[PDB]
Symmetry: C3
Subunit: 313 residues, 3 copies
């Protein structure tokens, strides 16, 4: 047990939550994801994960998320046991995990209830990847978001990112803010109506981490100063019975051609998806519309994590 360094397993046994990652780990995972890009663009079929089986358990169905993981597995030469609709007499999640783990080498689970992923990881003796834990953690979304910024902008230190939309309740913007705080000289703009502003826990965490942040309800002003505009929807229900606030916000938190008109030439638009009319279809025609390149980057990040969890470094 004395062998060290080159004389190796991934330090994570499961991928469950953002707080598992530090800056050095992110940088190394992103290095692996760049290698996975090279593999996926090659004409030659990879055999890195030949002989390994992934079981997907989508209790909350997600065609996009599931296919990204299943594609990642097959692009590496692994195979897949698919369950696109795992929601179905007496079965705890723990009993399903303890059965399915006998049939597979890795489990990818998306659930509709927060807390499921931690329970599955604690139960399983094979690696678990959380593919979305109800409205809670979605760690590979956060990883692919940061990777996309690094790819598109060329750096993570010193950038300005606008987080737009349902900041109070949105796991994607909260988790992205959490990981960005691991880099240096980051400035975050929180753009939203007051009723869905970012909660104090993330604000206090950013301040404690030395991250500059600013709240604004003026998307046109913020977007002109940012490298990244990261958009999410504010659903009508989040205004509750306050129709006056819904009407005051109408048309004010949309990414449209006019917004792109004030943005820098090398800035980007991101969106974790699914996207509705909070990004207009016209925006898609702009090279700065990065949300489908972002989704593609999920393939490379998920390839990297499957490789690391199954065969290590």
């Amino acid at each position: 047990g004395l062998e060290v360094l080159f004389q190796h397993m991934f330090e994570l046994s499961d991928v469950i939550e953002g707080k598992q990652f530090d800056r050095e780990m992110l940088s190394a995972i992103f290095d692996v994801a760049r290698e996975m890009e090279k593999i996926e663009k090659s004409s030659s079929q990879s055999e890195i994960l030949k002989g390994y089986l992934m079981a997907t358990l989508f209790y909350e169905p997600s065609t996009r998320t599931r296919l990204s993981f299943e594609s990642a597995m097959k692009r590496l030469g692994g195979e897949v046991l698919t369950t696109e609709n795992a929601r179905e007499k007496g079965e705890t999640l723990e009993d399903t995990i303890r059965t399915v783990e006998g049939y597979s080498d890795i489990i990818v689970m998306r659930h509709f209830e927060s807390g499921a992923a931690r329970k599955a990881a604690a139960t399983a003796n094979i690696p678990v990847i959380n593919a979305g834990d109800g409205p809670g953690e979605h760690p590979t979304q956060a990883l692919l978001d940061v990777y996309t910024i690094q790819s598109e902008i060329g750096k993570l230190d010193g950038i300005s990112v606008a987080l737009v939309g349902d900041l109070a309740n949105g796991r994607t913007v909260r988790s992205l803010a959490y990981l960005l705080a691991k880099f240096k000289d980051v400035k975050i703009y929180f753009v939203s109506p007051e009723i869905v502003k970012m909660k104090d826990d993330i604000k206090d965490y950013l301040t404690s981490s030395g991250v500059e942040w600013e709240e604004s309800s003026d998307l046109m002003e913020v977007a002109s100063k940012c490298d990244v505009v990261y958009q999410t929807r504010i659903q009508r229900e989040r205004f509750g019975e306050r129709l006056d606030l819904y009407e005051a916000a109408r048309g004010k938190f949309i990414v449209d051609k006019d917004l792109l008109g004030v943005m820098q030439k090398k800035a980007i638009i991101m969106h974790p998806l699914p996207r509705l009319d909070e990004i207009t279809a016209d925006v898609d025609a702009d090279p700065r519309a990065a949300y489908f390149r972002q989704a593609k980057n999920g393939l490379f990040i998920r390839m990297a994590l499957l490789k690391l969890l199954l065969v290590g470094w």
Copy 2:
């Protein structure tokens, strides 16, 4: 050289010479499928199946075809699970090399092809078209009757909503001296867009309500299911359209010895079970042929001629 089509969406995309060449490739794919050795033609390629409506033959034949050629498959049997179709397609194309989609809306497959930079195959777009059914149907006719020029074909059943017979009519129009009979309840007669296309193409067609007479004169009797899911809330019209045109032993008794019965499947009551024993009952051979035709299309779209 590369395949002249970038997508397989509409029956009108195919010309006569292309059809004959595809049929040759299908016969080569039958040799692969019967062989003991595992093909690697499509090694490294991934197909995404996106099925928004139920399917047995179309989805499984495409998936089997891909695997028999050495490619692999990402399956979605329940894609209705919202975002636009264009968002779904631009996402899924990042994960795959070809998309096979059955959608519930007519026109969806052409929208998908216009958005995607990888080949799209229309596995059925609402009551619109079903081009690979039409391809395997014409391949089956050629295989069973030995000719396409000069044949007489009866299209029977729910023609209005039948994406199968709509695409098949487009392909039959590429051959010479074809006669098509339309036999249906009035409720579900063939739509005017198909009628107008055949008339403009110079294809002789005739509506009749006398299936015994029509069947006695045809090389092919192509029966269809009354398309319940397309009737919406008009379940009155659905039940009224059923039971009027049945392929049974008495109908086979007036048909020529060299004629065939086809059906894209599934059938409910409209072909009786005792027809299956007749050598002219071709609908299970027809379904098997879809494997070879879909192998041919995957090969052509991904690696060319």
Copy 3:
């Protein structure tokens, strides 16, 4: 090398003692394959179609994993009732006849008993019954017997308690049926009175050389058995009498106190899923064998796929 004597795996009565023992030996070979670092290619080139008219993630994945661990491939239908063309009204026979055009073996779980026999008669390729509504589930019975052999070390001379709804339980009836092919077996029947084991099984056991005993005292029985085989009380079997379901439900529980009276090397089995009839505490005991049991289903199902497609 020779052909497997079965063309399909449909029902327990297809199996005799010699066949069971031979399949269990193959299953041990499959365990060695599954533990190996090398991908098997025994079933390279073969295709399985799964047709789960009654969705069952655990059962379906066990079969699909078995196929892929042997190097074969799979055409999946997770919910054939809703997403195959059965949803358009297609008969089972037409579905099976069609699907064999794309595949080499069909694994089907249906909601209606009699479906598996119909599929086998229609198909000219092997069919495996993965659960025939309330009827036969033959690979569950096979993996159950295999698990006993593996955990206890023998099948001759064992004592097994079958606990739960014995009257209608396909798993306990089918397990009793196969255990009777071995020698000097004793079976204890523990159940609420309303769902006692029916006379057809009792008479078969008596005439097959199996001693059996009814008891309502699980604590007494469990101290004398190699195997306590627990099942879930199912609401549907009580019709329009929820009150009778609730009365039956909590009467026979495998809990820490029951484990405390069991023998040192006895085991607890359960076909799954379970509700509360095995308490969570029990999972911590090495004698809790129901997850090893589920894993053994992989090896048994690998063995059957191999035998049906490439023989002995």
